[PDB]
Symmetry: none
Subunit: 196 residues, 2 copies
Amino acid sequence: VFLFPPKPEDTLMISRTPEVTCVVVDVSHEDPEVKFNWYVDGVEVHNAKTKPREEQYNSTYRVVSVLTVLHQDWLNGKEYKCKVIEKTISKAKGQPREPQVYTLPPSREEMTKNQVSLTCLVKGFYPSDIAVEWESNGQPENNYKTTPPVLDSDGSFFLYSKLTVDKSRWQQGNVFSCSVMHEALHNHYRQKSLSL
Amino acid sequence: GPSVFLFPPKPEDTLMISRTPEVTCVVVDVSHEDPEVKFNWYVDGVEVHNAKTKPREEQYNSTYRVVSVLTVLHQDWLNGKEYKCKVSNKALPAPIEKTISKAKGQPREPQVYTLPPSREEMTKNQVSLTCLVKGFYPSDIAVEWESNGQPENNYKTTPPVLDSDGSFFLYSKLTVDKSRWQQGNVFSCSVMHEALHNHYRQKSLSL
Ligand SMILES: *[C@@H]1O[C@H](CO[C@@H]2O[C@@H](C)[C@@H](O)[C@@H](O)[C@@H]2O)[C@@H](O[C@@H]2O[C@H](CO)[C@@H](O[C@@H]3O[C@H](CO[C@H]4O[C@H](CO)[C@@H](O)[C@H](O)[C@@H]4O[C@@H]4O[C@H](CO)[C@@H](O)[C@H](O)[C@H]4NC(C)=O)[C@@H](O)[C@H](O[C@H]4O[C@H](CO)[C@@H](O)[C@H](O)[C@@H]4O[C@@H]4O[C@H](CO)[C@@H](O)[C@H](O)[C@H]4NC(C)=O)[C@@H]3O)[C@H](O)[C@H]2NC(C)=O)[C@H](O)[C@H]1NC(C)=O
Ligand SMILES: *[C@@H]1O[C@H](CO[C@@H]2O[C@@H](C)[C@@H](O)[C@@H](O)[C@@H]2O)[C@@H](O[C@@H]2O[C@H](CO)[C@@H](O[C@@H]3O[C@H](CO[C@H]4O[C@H](CO)[C@@H](O)[C@H](O)[C@@H]4O[C@@H]4O[C@H](CO)[C@@H](O)[C@H](O)[C@H]4NC(C)=O)[C@@H](O)[C@H](O[C@H]4O[C@H](CO)[C@@H](O)[C@H](O)[C@@H]4O)[C@@H]3O)[C@H](O)[C@H]2NC(C)=O)[C@H](O)[C@H]1NC(C)=O
């Protein structure tokens, strides 16, 4: 039994739906039926949905149960238990740290190419639950990738977000904004601009 | 009962000719009534007998951990030689065969860009040096920092991220004191990849 936490961006963005996943493995053919009992801080709920079983290569079934949760509950540190084996996960306990957002312009050597990369460094935050978005002139970007949180030496986490845009746009003096959402932020939001 | 895990050699060991690459075969969940584990290594079918097996290791969950290490050649691993680890045990119905090799696919040369600290970060006593490595394949890579010949220690590298063009990218952040950066010292970002010239690429960064 494995109890996975909701996606970091799903617990911050109200437009998405955070889910707690309970993956059960090594299920026997003699006993395929698996009963799931979810508990939110003790109180038993019944709004969980179970996905159809999938036979693995090692002749075992893989039963997965999904429980949709609220954004406020997880952020406040609600205790979620999965009774199959009784696993239990929750929000990362510990003193929250404010992230430091730094936007970085493309390297001079990258100007030789047709497309440049915009860098947004976010460091010194806790916990690792975070969401990063890019936007330009109000309209959001789509061609960007963000690295998973990395545990730094001081106990906090950090990551990077790379936006790829045409060199023409960057040379025309356009303004790109790096949006960061985190628990220990004012209004759970911080933004930094970047232009030539 | 017992499970077998075959680990690939360190990326920097297969590229640096001074280091020694080795394929590790880790066996867990070994019964106390049968700690006898047989290892059989095969290189593209041909069985080798130069492996070095370490004695058993008692774990906290009342199980043993037998580890077999096989040193390999740099040219062999890079050419895509297939390495097989046959594990035999009395508690096993049939010998378990795990098999690993170099990640198949056409190699791509990584592009290394060093980025100076932000202006806002200059307020702090510790600034961050950024190294961007993008457009490489496969994900097997190694990144290191150095200054004045001597290597740095206070840095961290993000795991490779699959980009939109099918290639991988990552970042490496070096944390130095602002006094060093303002003194005019030079910091270099060392990158080791199989698609690079002499499997090495380095870019410098200074104020
Ligand atoms: C009894 O205890 C032992 C020992 O565990 C220890 O004791 C217990 C009591 C606890 O306290 C533990 O916290 C403690 O560690 C248990 O043995 C464990 O068994 C599990 C499996 O059930 C193993 O998990 C695997 O881990 C590997 C990665 O292992 C590296 O990283 C670990 C930290 O992340 C580290 O602890 C390991 O030592 C090892 O470290 C690496 O070592 C090599 C060489 O030694 C070195 O070169 C590396 O640099 C170094 N790396 C690091 C980070 O240190 C993980 O890869 C495995 O994932 C595979 O298997 C999964 C299914 O189990 C699957 O989901 C994955 O996708 C992946 O599957 C493979 O994927 C590859 C592609 O990548 C594919 O090619 C393969 O075909 C595919 N194979 C399969 C089978 O799917 C896996 O998660 C633990 O490592 C192991 N512990 C140790 C110390 O080895 C034992 O289970 C306990 N018994 C009971 C009954 O509970
Ligand atoms: C029969 O086969 C089953 C299926 O295994 C699969 O098929 C085989 C052929 C191989 O391809 C495997 O690679 C593959 O997984 C086995 O089930 C597996 O059991 C093992 C443990 O027994 C599980 O390993 C555990 O993995 C956790 C992380 O799992 C995520 O990441 C995986 C990739 O890294 C991904 O494959 C998983 O699906 C899962 O992905 C996440 O899913 C959630 C929910 O859907 C999402 O929210 C996330 O975003 C996903 N993340 C992604 C996509 O990156 C580890 O966390 C876990 O570690 C913990 O336990 C170990 C001990 O087991 C500790 O040492 C460790 O410290 C830590 O506490 C563990 O490694 C594996 O995930 C299971 N497979 C699947 C598909 O879930 C059966 O075990 C096997 N039966 C027998 C008898 O062998």
